[PDB]
């Protein structure tokens, strides 16, 4: 159903196509243990207190 | 795909991604032809074995010739299927028709089980084999590596079932499976052609099946179905692990076989069949001619998933 | 085949390397060349002033970056055009560059940087 | 592999007639969710804790492989590495030691606004030459009690 | 003999962008769980353990 | 093109030159050849016993008339076969031979006639 190799006046078959999708991992991001804290400024502070 | 590199905000610089890569390949396929003839001089005067004074007819001779031809074609088909499962489609004579590893630009994977060493980690090798399929499938979906066929030979099976680790582990069990494997028949499941029940062994999530198939060519050299081309010690066991049918799903089937028509007239540009049988009569009543054709090629679109297994150490 | 495999080839580079370009009614970053002799142009090759590909040592004479696929046998581009077009002025392309043998990228990048051509990191 | 191979654990588990003991030894293991490439991940149960085998890796621009479960400075193949971090239920939702902050992109109308995970911008080229795209992300994850991020090794001190 | 379309190209490009960001986020989450946050280029000069004391 | 015309070649000869041949279970008139490296075969070309084409001065060494289209760098015939097949024994062919330059046609035909090959007068 398509042109052959090395000739234009003959025919050949395509018979589909294979694919190679890379490997992606999502275990840690799927754990959902990180809590989103959206903020406005470009730098956030924090003060640490520890009683003796 | 790749990981993004962090860039600063004010200097508004960014990153880009490479485009796709599309190629094309083609496949040639093997042609088989078989000819047999019936001549009256092989029927006249000859005696039917098992009968006192009865002569053979043309019908029995023709039936036996056709049965032998069909059996030969089936046996060759089985050998070619096993060769395709090995990853390299080599003809019985020895000519190369389709090197799937070079065509798809992947490399062969082999695993050394090290069955001779009493301290070998059979679990580690099984896990490596299990994880290789999931890593190298690259179909984009989720792969289950436990769904594979592991076919081994007699020596590998004997070495595996007699390993001190496996035997000592299964001895300290009170399950029916352990009782069957230790003191019981190890022949669940089969019909290997000759056997009513082939040997199989359950250790982890996988099974090991012993296949004794072997054929011979006209040169007389035997062709063991479960073997590695090159390796021929007697003290090493060899195996072949290939994906199960229900691992990548029916959407992604990687084992296919093609069939194209014979070069006789009538059959040009038609859909290929398993086998063509033709009836031809010799002139002057000199007998009958028979021809059998087959134009096929078995191939695997993901040869990386065909993993070899050995019993010695690397 | 006798070698066990047959490969019909790979798809030619596509015209996706251009990220930004000064769009003007008649085109500002694009210039046309007269194809020289029997030469095979592809997308992403660096050409000289006369139109031939840059070679080793001629790195300072980097004039433009080819953005068409030309065929010597047909004497026509892959879009059925008589000429070969390259990017020689202010533009922002990708790192995909088809260099010849023995030609370093650093000298080519600096030569094209003077004309106003920038290359963005592309990765995989 | 070294943990499940250890003779002490193996001998403690060989002498127990429980389905768990039949599973951890001469069993399938592979009891867990998907990580992205495999249906199930190896998990071993011993002493009330669970060891989960995670094998995830990525690559940067320059072909360098970044293993997710690794310790910087050690590249020995024989040694094994691991990471232990507190579970969500260990401290309760009043001390999530884990947070990720988001900040706005530097476009007009986005200054001093609560940032989001992703900024997708689509721009039409001039004349009629095609479409331009932009994606932005201004984020940093952090832990407020890093002393609970214990890493384990399979070799001796 | 089927031509490609703009929709397919745009969809695949956008999907690649999204999965690139997803895998980068996963890598950064792993880095945060390890103790110090370093990008793919490896911008590393000191620990964050030491600055949390 | 730049020359005004863009001819894309002519169809390769078809395997219709055989008018009569000795039909036999295993190919009486068909003989296999191992293809020579970097050599194109077409339907009609005369080959020696070695497998190469009959050049000038060696017309008496004609062995067979090739009936397959081999594609050299493909190392496969136009029917996907691995070897070149030419008719050498008793057969009747059309008067369509693709002889090389400087090769005497009469000497080649006389050499092939001894083998049993005949050529039927064609027309135009």
Author numbering:
A (entry chain B): 2 to 53
B (entry chain A): 54 to 367
C (entry chain M), F (entry chain K): 2 to 125
D (entry chain B): 211 to 367
E (entry chain B): 106 to 158
Show me the paper's own sentences about this structure:
Bacteriophage Sf14 infects the human pathogen Shigella flexneri. Here, we report multiple high-resolution structures of the full Sf14 particle, including symmetric and asymmetric reconstructions of the virion capsid, empty capsid, portal region, tail, and baseplate. Sf14 virions have a spherical icosahedral capsid of 820 Å in diameter, which is connected to a long, contractile tail that is approximately 1205 Å long and an average of 235 Å in diameter, expanding to 315 Å at the baseplate. Overall, phage Sf14 appears to share some similarities to other model phages, but in different combinations: both λ- and T4-like decoration proteins, HK97-like capsid and portal proteins, T4/Mu-like tail fibers, a Mu-like baseplate, and a P2-like tail needle.
In addition to the virion capsid, we determined the structure of spontaneous empty capsids, which have a mixture of non-attached or attached tails, the latter of which are contracted or non-contracted, but contain no genome. These particles are prevalent in typical Sf14 preparations and were hypothesized to be destabilized capsids lacking at least one decoration protein. However, these proteins are still present in the empty capsids and the etiology of these particles remains elusive. We hypothesized that the large proportion of empty capsids could be due to a loss of one or both decoration proteins. However, after resolving a separate structure based on empty particles alone, we did not see observable differences in the capsid composition or conformation. Results shown here are consistent with this hypothesis, as even degraded capsids without genome still contain both decoration proteins. The gp33 decoration proteins may be serving another function, such as host attachment or particle aggregation, or they may stabilize the capsid during DNA packaging but subsequently lose the genome through weakness elsewhere.
